[PDB]
Amino acid sequence: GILDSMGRLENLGRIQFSVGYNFQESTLTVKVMKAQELPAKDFSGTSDPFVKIYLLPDKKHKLETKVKRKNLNPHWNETFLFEGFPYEKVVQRILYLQVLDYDRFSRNDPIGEVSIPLNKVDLTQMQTFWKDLKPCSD
Ligand SMILES: [Ca+2]
Ligand SMILES: [Ca+2]
Ligand SMILES: [Ca+2]
Numbered sequence: 001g002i003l004d005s006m007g008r009l010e011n012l013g014r015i016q017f018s019v020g021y022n023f024q025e026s027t028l029t030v031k032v033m034k035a036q037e038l039p040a041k042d043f044s045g046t047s048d049p050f051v052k053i054y055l056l057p058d059k060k061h062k063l064e065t066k067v068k069r070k071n072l073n074p075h076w077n078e079t080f081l082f083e084g085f086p087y088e089k090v091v092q093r094i095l096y097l098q099v100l101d102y103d104r105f106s107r108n109d110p111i112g113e114v115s116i117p118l119n120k121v122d123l124t125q126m127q128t129f130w131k132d133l134k135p136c137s138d
Pocket of ligand 2: 041042047048101102103104
């Protein structure tokens with residue numbers, strides 16, 4: 001009855017991204033900028049990170065960044081557009097980012113996740129955020 005949770009945060013790195021809405025175009029922009037201090041998820045001692053972008057509760061339709069080979073501090077600087085997306089639907093979504101290590105001979109390795117409800121963002125301007133990656137394990 002004091003707070004939701006308290007505890008140690010696993011050091012999974014952090015990610016920077018921006019989001020904003022253009023009302024004339026009815027377009028939501030999400031820019032996945034860069035990540036820092038990602039863990040190594042390959043026996044080579046690096047990872048091959050990419051980001052999956054969801055607008056929850058839509059768990060089916062996602063976008064993805066490119067894979068940055070052997071890079072624990074990737075700079076994607078990739079811009080994604082959700083064009084002709086009505087504003088009244090936008091504010092009902094949660095922007096969800098999942099960072100993974102791309103693998104060749106096994107399944108990709110999830111690293112961590114972040115999210116932000118778009119109804120808590122002032123989308124009239126591009127807003128930029130840093131968030132520490134949280135565990136995305138089941
Ligand atoms: Ca791996
Ligand atoms: Ca890998
Ligand atoms: Ca793997």
